[PDB]
Design an enzyme around this catalytic site. Structure first.
Site, PDB file in Angstrom:
ATOM      1  N   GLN B  11       0.815  -1.209   0.000  1.00  0.00           N
ATOM      2  CA  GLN B  11       0.000   0.000   0.000  1.00  0.00           C
ATOM      3  C   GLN B  11       0.830   1.231   0.000  1.00  0.00           C
ATOM      4  OE1 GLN B  11      -3.556   0.743   2.667  1.00  0.00           O
ATOM      5  NE2 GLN B  11      -2.204   2.353   3.425  1.00  0.00           N
ATOM      6  N   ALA B  12       1.784   1.364   0.925  1.00  0.00           N
ATOM      7  CA  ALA B  12       2.612   2.557   1.002  1.00  0.00           C
ATOM      8  C   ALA B  12       3.372   2.806  -0.278  1.00  0.00           C
ATOM      9  CB  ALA B  12       3.547   2.498   2.198  1.00  0.00           C
ATOM     10  N   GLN B  15       0.839   3.717  -3.139  1.00  0.00           N
ATOM     11  CA  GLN B  15       0.349   5.068  -2.863  1.00  0.00           C
ATOM     12  C   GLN B  15       1.358   6.194  -3.150  1.00  0.00           C
ATOM     13  OE1 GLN B  15      -2.666   5.602  -2.593  1.00  0.00           O
ATOM     14  NE2 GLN B  15      -3.773   4.365  -1.092  1.00  0.00           N
ATOM     15  N   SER B 140       7.054   0.137   1.942  1.00  0.00           N
ATOM     16  CA  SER B 140       7.128   0.449   3.360  1.00  0.00           C
ATOM     17  C   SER B 140       8.004  -0.588   4.082  1.00  0.00           C
ATOM     18  CB  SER B 140       5.744   0.401   3.982  1.00  0.00           C
ATOM     19  OG  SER B 140       5.216  -0.894   3.770  1.00  0.00           O
ATOM     20  N   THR B 179       0.294   1.173  11.608  1.00  0.00           N
ATOM     21  CA  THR B 179      -0.807   0.213  11.425  1.00  0.00           C
ATOM     22  C   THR B 179      -0.620  -1.043  12.315  1.00  0.00           C
ATOM     23  OG1 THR B 179       0.297  -0.401   9.292  1.00  0.00           O
ATOM     24  CG2 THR B 179      -1.783   0.867   9.109  1.00  0.00           C
ATOM     25  N   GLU B 183       5.706  -3.611  13.384  1.00  0.00           N
ATOM     26  CA  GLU B 183       6.423  -2.779  12.426  1.00  0.00           C
ATOM     27  C   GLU B 183       7.922  -2.794  12.662  1.00  0.00           C
ATOM     28  OE1 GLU B 183       2.692  -0.204  10.850  1.00  0.00           O
ATOM     29  OE2 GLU B 183       4.380   1.009  11.560  1.00  0.00           O
ATOM     30  N   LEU B 252      21.772   5.940 -12.463  1.00  0.00           N
ATOM     31  CA  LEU B 252      21.719   5.142 -11.238  1.00  0.00           C
ATOM     32  C   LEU B 252      23.095   4.881 -10.637  1.00  0.00           C
ATOM     33  CD1 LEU B 252      18.984   2.443 -11.666  1.00  0.00           C
ATOM     34  CD2 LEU B 252      18.830   4.516 -10.422  1.00  0.00           C
ATOM     35  N   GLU B 254      25.760   6.752 -10.777  1.00  0.00           N
ATOM     36  CA  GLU B 254      26.188   8.013 -10.187  1.00  0.00           C
ATOM     37  C   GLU B 254      25.665   8.184  -8.766  1.00  0.00           C
ATOM     38  OE1 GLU B 254      26.779  11.400 -13.671  1.00  0.00           O
ATOM     39  OE2 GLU B 254      26.672  11.817 -11.511  1.00  0.00           O
TER      40      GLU B 254
HETATM   41  N1  LIG Z   1       3.447   7.830   3.702  1.00  0.00           N
HETATM   42  C1  LIG Z   1       2.659   6.762   3.676  1.00  0.00           C
HETATM   43  N2  LIG Z   1       2.897   5.748   4.508  1.00  0.00           N
HETATM   44  C2  LIG Z   1       1.984   4.755   4.397  1.00  0.00           C
HETATM   45  C3  LIG Z   1       0.906   4.684   3.540  1.00  0.00           C
HETATM   46  N3  LIG Z   1       0.173   3.531   3.775  1.00  0.00           N
HETATM   47  C4  LIG Z   1       0.803   2.944   4.758  1.00  0.00           C
HETATM   48  N4  LIG Z   1       1.911   3.622   5.175  1.00  0.00           N
HETATM   49  C5  LIG Z   1       2.809   3.199   6.244  1.00  0.00           C
HETATM   50  O1  LIG Z   1       3.407   1.967   5.869  1.00  0.00           O
HETATM   51  C6  LIG Z   1       3.422   1.064   7.002  1.00  0.00           C
HETATM   52  C7  LIG Z   1       2.502  -0.119   6.763  1.00  0.00           C
HETATM   53  O2  LIG Z   1       2.740  -0.773   5.504  1.00  0.00           O
HETATM   54  P1  LIG Z   1       1.570  -0.983   4.390  1.00  0.00           P
HETATM   55  O3  LIG Z   1       2.132  -0.354   3.110  1.00  0.00           O
HETATM   56  O4  LIG Z   1       0.220  -0.456   4.716  1.00  0.00           O
HETATM   57  O5  LIG Z   1       1.457  -2.544   4.109  1.00  0.00           O
HETATM   58  P2  LIG Z   1       1.611  -3.552   2.888  1.00  0.00           P
HETATM   59  O6  LIG Z   1       2.947  -3.342   2.219  1.00  0.00           O
HETATM   60  O7  LIG Z   1       0.458  -3.441   1.971  1.00  0.00           O
HETATM   61  O8  LIG Z   1       1.571  -4.985   3.570  1.00  0.00           O
HETATM   62  P3  LIG Z   1       0.340  -5.876   4.025  1.00  0.00           P
HETATM   63  O9  LIG Z   1      -0.903  -5.015   3.851  1.00  0.00           O
HETATM   64  O10 LIG Z   1       0.513  -6.256   5.387  1.00  0.00           O
HETATM   65  O11 LIG Z   1       0.283  -7.058   3.044  1.00  0.00           O
HETATM   66  C8  LIG Z   1       3.051   1.945   8.194  1.00  0.00           C
HETATM   67  O12 LIG Z   1       4.215   2.604   8.698  1.00  0.00           O
HETATM   68  C9  LIG Z   1       2.071   2.923   7.548  1.00  0.00           C
HETATM   69  O13 LIG Z   1       1.740   4.094   8.282  1.00  0.00           O
HETATM   70  C10 LIG Z   1       0.690   5.774   2.628  1.00  0.00           C
HETATM   71  O14 LIG Z   1      -0.179   5.850   1.767  1.00  0.00           O
HETATM   72  N5  LIG Z   1       1.622   6.784   2.787  1.00  0.00           N
HETATM   73 MG   LIG Z   2      -1.418  -3.698   2.360  1.00  0.00          MG
END
Ligand SMILES: Nc1nc2c(ncn2[C@@H]2O[C@H](COP(=O)(O)OP(=O)(O)OP(=O)(O)O)[C@@H](O)[C@H]2O)c(=O)[nH]1
Ligand SMILES: [Mg+2]
Ligand SMILES: Nc1nc2c(ncn2[C@@H]2O[C@H](COP(=O)(O)OP(=O)(O)OP(=O)(O)O)[C@@H](O)[C@H]2O)c(=O)[nH]1
Ligand SMILES: [Mg+2]
EC number: 3.6.5.-
Lengths: 433, 440, 49, 157, 151
Positions: B11-12, B15, B140, B179, B183, B252, B254
């Site tokens: 997700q991170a 996103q 993340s 989350t 972590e 890259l 560099e």
């Molecule tokens: N800046 C930022 N950090 C994020 C975002 N989403 C999650 N995080 C951070 O990333 C960490 C959690 O990882 P996630 O990316 O949600 O998880 P994932 O990689 O999808 O892994 P699983 O869902 O467990 O399969 C925490 O520190 C979150 O606050 C986002 O959109 N932006």
């Molecule tokens: Mg996820």
């Protein structure tokens, strides 16, 4: 994504029926099955507890079970009794009369495969089943005995699935049944081994909240069940609506359960209301925080001050300041630092749903894994030892083929649970070697 | 050209990744349907964006990106968005059930199923490359997918693309947006297994971003949308050297040549400036001297730490906008005249500089305002070990009690992997201390 | 709990009269099937593999 | 009417100002801007010199041929290669012999831009030069010549 | 006055205060510390031999040259590095040939400490070693080589 719901016995079907009545109102679903709400958020995560049908007519993914034939009939005549799948009702020829052995070994073990078939026909239509949710009580024979048999049988067929339960605790001030500590100890042995998360809903705590806090001089099951409705609706908000934290049974278990066997949660709710409470006023974020963490608002007869929290989950509901919530939630940990284990940093997680509960403008829900839950397991061990010492009613169980060594295992595992719960309460965040 | 493939994991990473591409399009004049027309085009002949964007036989510029997640929710928002046309369907890969914030689940249990499919869609992009440089991995540290799947993918990429460089952008965990309690476990586990497969890692401390959001952008309680708009603004200034005509950090390799003294110490700190709230854009703009000095205020760092508690090994200043080279030279000479900015004795004491004259770019209708000039300082300070120390303290706090460890062993991982990963962080921290320990 | 001891002794008096007639079984006294059960530590097999 | 502004800016004491002006001059593409963009090719800042080379190609006036040819010997890789691409756009066969020398350049982008420029020019002057280059030329330049002749063969060999 | 306390703490059977002794001897600096800091470069502990190099390096004595050259062929990378950087701080030209032998070291960080120290001497044999390194060296070491050559 999908959760399979099972409700066993009188208590199981009573709390379980109230669960579907509350969540269907929040999700816009009327007794016919069709939607009639306003927000698009209501349907966003509908697939978790429902099945779409005909022209988008939502059916609960519930399996209604009880050896008593009459329970099937009382459910159907309820407000949402015409919304359940007629094939998902598995009901026997006579109840176990509060005899755990009948439900786990003889009468209940005949009915189990029929239920498993229904479990299968609902697990087969899951795009991605996440786990199971059993509502039942440990006081009787069906919910406690047959319910714990469904758990093992499900754990051997779905070993990589989450087993989540809402287990109701016996209290001698709620039921006159002398054999209830035997069934509670026998079910707790099964829960300790085969469940991933258990919400300890103590009838002692519900009887006390109604009598002391709510001032209800003559508490009924409907008044006790109202508290359970608020609790079950609150603890499940995370999986029912789009969120970041504890949004699935597995992610919830990874954040709450540090030790495989220490998965017994002390729920809590704020504010405490009773059916017909017209005269009221919206609660501020500081009020919801202080109440939610207090022993007066606990659904388990324990005081978290006589213990430490390993993990906690706070669920706030309503249009409120997300900075004010954070401030209060930080202040609670930063003031009461003496009630949280220091060797688990950042153990309290906070989620906020914009959609508030039924009738309420704002609410807070607490889910805590506290070492002070040993005060619930000591109550059942003292009550069980009181009967097991004089060897009362052992023929009632062994007569159904049950082993006497099973009572010794159930007892020696519940005492071990208390000693493990205390070893982590007195544990120091130290490096001595 | 000399192409770079971006891989977004979890997700991170997904996103942050989409927010970066949104900015890349605005910087290079690309519209959300791949079109680069007469109107939105920049001119000047800058064709260096062709390392990040392939071209169809109909002027459609498609990002060389891969999006992977073990769940649909985050990537479904891409295929249903503004940029739903920009990426080819096969670039967005999704699973059915995630790694539930468990490293072992992403790296072993769930991840082992989608790993071979991902290599396939990566190879399909690597095939449209006449000279692939390497990969940019956004993920993340705390996610199950982010920590675990990324680690798995880096192990595989080294086997399948040996001579190619791997550069990460890793979201480092913050308590204000955490989350999961595990972590710190996931962050230490991913860092250990990824340490030999990555050539340059840029940590994005989420607390540092939250702090900039609160102070500089006046945001009481920033959402991930707010954090993402800032992280893209910073990550884009780091990757602009790769997509624009320039003389510093052009490719890259560099990044390693200019920032990584030796392989293990590959964690440079980005310090971006100026970060200005949209409501405050109509005040006289900051000068080159003002923003060069801001790179040395820790308040503007992408990772929370004090560079004054360590020493420098490398320093790269990448200016953008209305920057006159003579003003930069004067500002650098002023910095060099500071006894507080200390370099290690075994590294050369200097500041490499590059100025891109194209005006800086911000997302319209965003918490950030448009400036005349901005800089990003990529420095390699032994004080980045302060960020590892915070994770290692929380890791040792729970591992001493074996808290949550069962979730990992039950998912195809061994207990000895935690001892093994932590021995690597003790070796890393002791190394960072032992190199910035002296100077005269 | 005065109702508690009143039911324990009732069961003791009722299980003494019921066993007076039910203690004359036929042919080789075969034992009644002792049922296997969940033994402490069995639910910890999920987190070891 | 805004061309008047960007011409004076082309020689402002501030390099980003002359740059932004050379960028806008290519976007406008006027006859009036041809001579000042020819002066811009001798600027000490390469970011301005490289932008002038592109701008002189987008405008494409014959007057830019001799000054863009001498930019192929420039110390900067983006100025040499971006000037070869302008010589390819203009198509003047005066660029042919200087463009064949750029095929032995150190930078890959300059070598690649020069081959693409030789291809954009075409005609009998490039064809004869590529037939010879595929005999007295070695390595990459030989490869460019054999590709040229094969992509320009009128029959299936 | 109290420099004789750390002066004999190098031959201490307990290593904690033994390493701490060279940390204060090098910061104060006395003409008597020249002799015991040489015996600290022959220890079994790496933290002791590496702290001895920094103490003997600050005190720019030639007596440090002869043993500090033997510390470049050490089993540890941190000892070799602080010993090469000590030679660079003192300046003895006889330490040029052994520092060139350190540029082709197993540890990529020893090669950078040796190059920094060889650049500090800056003799004429250093000029050819830095032209060679600017061709036969890693991306970062080839960049160190060209920054020194810009003199
Ligand atoms: N800046 C930022 N950090 C994020 C975002 N989403 C999650 N995080 C951070 O990333 C960490 C959690 O990882 P996630 O990316 O949600 O998880 P994932 O990689 O999808 O892994 P699983 O869902 O467990 O399969 C925490 O520190 C979150 O606050 C986002 O959109 N932006
Ligand atoms: Mg996820
Ligand atoms: N809170 C609450 N407890 C209930 C309710 N109904 C029964 N109980 C409790 O459940 C326990 C007895 O188990 P039951 O559920 O009634 O029995 P059963 O599961 O049907 O099993 P059998 O009686 O053996 O057929 C006691 O602790 C009761 O107080 C209810 O609606 N609410
Ligand atoms: Mg019943």
């Amino acid at each position: 994504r999908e959760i399979v719901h099972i409700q066993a016995g009188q208590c199981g079907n009573q709390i379980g029926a109230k669960f579907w009545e509350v969540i269907s109102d929040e999700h816009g679903i009327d007794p016919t099955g069709s939607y009639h709400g306003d927000s698009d958020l209501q349907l966003e995560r509908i697939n978790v507890y429902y099945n779409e049908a005909t022209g988008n007519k939502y059916v609960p993914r519930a399996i209604l079970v009880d050896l008593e034939p009459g329970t099937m009939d009382s459910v159907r005549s309820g407000p949402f009794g015409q919304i359940f799948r007629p094939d998902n009702f598995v009901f026997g020829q006579s109840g176990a009369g509060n005899n755990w052995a009948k439900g786990h070994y003889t009468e209940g073990a005949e009915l189990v495969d029929s239920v498993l078939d229904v479990v299968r026909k609902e697990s087969e239509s899951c795009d991605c089943l996440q786990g199971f949710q059993l509502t039942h009580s440990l006081g009787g024979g069906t919910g406690s005995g047959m319910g714990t048999l469904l758990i093992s049988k499900i754990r051997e067929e779905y070993p990589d699935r989450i087993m989540n339960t809402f287990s109701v605790m016996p209290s001698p001030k709620v039921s006159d049944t002398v054999v209830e500590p035997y069934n509670a100890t026998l079910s707790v042995h099964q829960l300790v081994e085969n469940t991933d998360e258990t919400y300890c809903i103590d009838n002692e705590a519900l009887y006390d909240i109604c009598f002391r806090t709510l001032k209800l001089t003559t508490p009924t099951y409907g008044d006790l069940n109202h508290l359970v409705s608020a609790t079950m609706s609150g603890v499940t908000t995370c999986l029912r609506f789009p969120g970041q934290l504890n949004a699935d049974l597995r992610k919830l278990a990874v954040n709450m359960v540090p030790f495989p066997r220490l998965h017994f949660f002390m729920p809590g709710f704020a504010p405490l209301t009773s059916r017909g409470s017209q005269q009221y006023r919206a609660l501020t974020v500081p009020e919801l925080t202080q109440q939610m963490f207090d022993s007066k608002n606990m659904m388990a007869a324990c005081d978290p001050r006589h213990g430490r929290y390993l993990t906690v989950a706070a669920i706030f509901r309503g249009r409120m300041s997300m900075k004010e919530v954070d401030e209060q939630m930080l202040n609670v940990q930063n003031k009461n630092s003496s009630y949280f284990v220091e060797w688990i940093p950042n153990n309290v997680k906070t989620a906020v749903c914009d959609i508030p509960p039924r009738g309420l403008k704002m609410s807070a829900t607490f889910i805590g894994n506290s070492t002070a839950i040993q005060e619930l397991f000591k109550r059942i061990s003292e009550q069980f030892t009181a009967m097991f010492r004089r060897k009362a009613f052992l023929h009632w169980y062994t007569g159904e083929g049950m082993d006497e060594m099973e009572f010794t295992e159930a007892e020696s595992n519940m005492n071990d649970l208390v000693s493990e719960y205390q070893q982590y309460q007195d544990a120091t965040a130290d490096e001595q070697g | 050209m000399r192409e770079c493939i971006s891989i977004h994991v979890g997700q991170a990473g997904v996103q942050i990744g989409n927010a970066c591409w949104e900015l890349y399009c605005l910087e290079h004049g690309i519209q959300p349907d791949g079109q680069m027309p007469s109107d939105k085009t920049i001119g000047g002949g800058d064709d260096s964006f062709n390392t990040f964007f392939s071209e169809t036989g109909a002027g459609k510029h498609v990002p060389r990106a891969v999006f992977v997640d073990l769940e649909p929710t985050v990537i479904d928002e891409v295929r249903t968005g503004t940029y739903r046309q920009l990426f080819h369907p096969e670039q967005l890969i999704t699973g059915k059930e995630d790694a539930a914030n468990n490293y072992a689940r992403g790296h072993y249990t769930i991840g082992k199923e989608i790993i071979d499919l991902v290599l396939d869609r990566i190879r399909k992009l690597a095939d449209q490359c006449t000279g692939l440089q390497g990969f940019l991995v956004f993920h993340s540290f705390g996610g199950g997918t982010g920590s675990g799947f990324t680690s798995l993918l880096m192990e595989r990429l080294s086997v399948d693309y040996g001579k190619k460089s791997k550069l990460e952008f890793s979201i480092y965990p913050a308590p204000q947006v955490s989350t999961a309690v595990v972590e710190p476990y996931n962050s230490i586990l991913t860092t250990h297994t990824t340490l030999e497969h990555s050539d340059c890692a840029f940590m994005v401390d989420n607390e540092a971003i939250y702090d900039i959001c609160r102070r500089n952008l006046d945001i009481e309680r920033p959402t991930y949308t707010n954090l993402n708009r800032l992280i893209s603004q910073i990550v884009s200034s780091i990757t602009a050297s790769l997509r624009f005509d320039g003389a510093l950090n052009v490719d890259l390799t560099e990044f390693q040549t200019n920032l990584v003294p030796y392989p293990r110490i590959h964690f440079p700190l980005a310090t971006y400036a100026p970060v200005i709230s949209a409501e405050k854009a109509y005040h006289e703009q900051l000068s080159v001297a003002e923003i060069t000095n801001a790179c040395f205020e820790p308040a503007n760092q992408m990772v929370k730490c004090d560079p004054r508690h360590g020493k420098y090994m490398a320093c790269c200043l990448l200016y953008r906008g209305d920057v006159v080279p003579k003003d930069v030279n004067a500002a650098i000479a002023t910095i060099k005249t500071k006894r507080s900015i200390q370099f290690v004795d075994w590294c050369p004491t200097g500041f490499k500089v590059g100025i891109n004259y194209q005006p800086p770019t911000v997302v319209p209708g965003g918490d950030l305002a448009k400036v005349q000039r901005a800089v990003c300082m990529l420095s390699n300070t032994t004080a980045i070990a302060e960020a590892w120390a915070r994770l290692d303290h929380k890791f040792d706090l729970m591992y001493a009690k074996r808290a949550f460890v069962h979730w990992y062993v039950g998912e195809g991982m061994e207990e000895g992997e935690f001892s093994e990963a932590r021995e690597d962080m003790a070796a890393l921290e002791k190394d960072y201390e032992e190199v910035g320990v002296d100077s005269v | 709990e005065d109702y508690m001891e009143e039911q324990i002794q009732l069961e003791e008096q009722e299980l003494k009269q019921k066993q007076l007639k039910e203690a004359e079984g036929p042919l080789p006294i075969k034992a009644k099937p002792k049922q296997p059960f969940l033994k402490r530590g069995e639910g910890l097999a999920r987190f070891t593999n | 009417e805004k061309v008047e502004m960007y011409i004076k800016n082309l020689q402002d004491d501030s390099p980003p100002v002359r740059f932004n002006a050379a960028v806008a001059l290519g976007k406008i593409g006027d006859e009036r801007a041809v001579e000042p963009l020819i002066k811009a090719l001798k600027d000490e800042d390469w970011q301005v010199r490289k932008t002038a080379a592109y701008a002189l190609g987008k405008i494409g006036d014959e007057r830019a041929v001799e000054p863009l040819i001498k930019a192929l010997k420039d110390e900067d890789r983006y100025v040499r290669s971006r000037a070869a691409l302008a010589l390819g756009k203009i198509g003047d066969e005066r660029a042919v012999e200087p463009l064949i020398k750029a095929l032995k350049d150190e930078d890959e982008y300059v070598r690649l831009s020069a081959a693409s420029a030789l291809g954009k020019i075409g005609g009998e002057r490039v064809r004869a030069a590529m037939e010879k280059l595929a005999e007295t030329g070695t390595g990459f330049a030989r490869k460019v010549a054999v590709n040229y002749l094969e992509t320009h063969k009128s029959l299936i060999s």
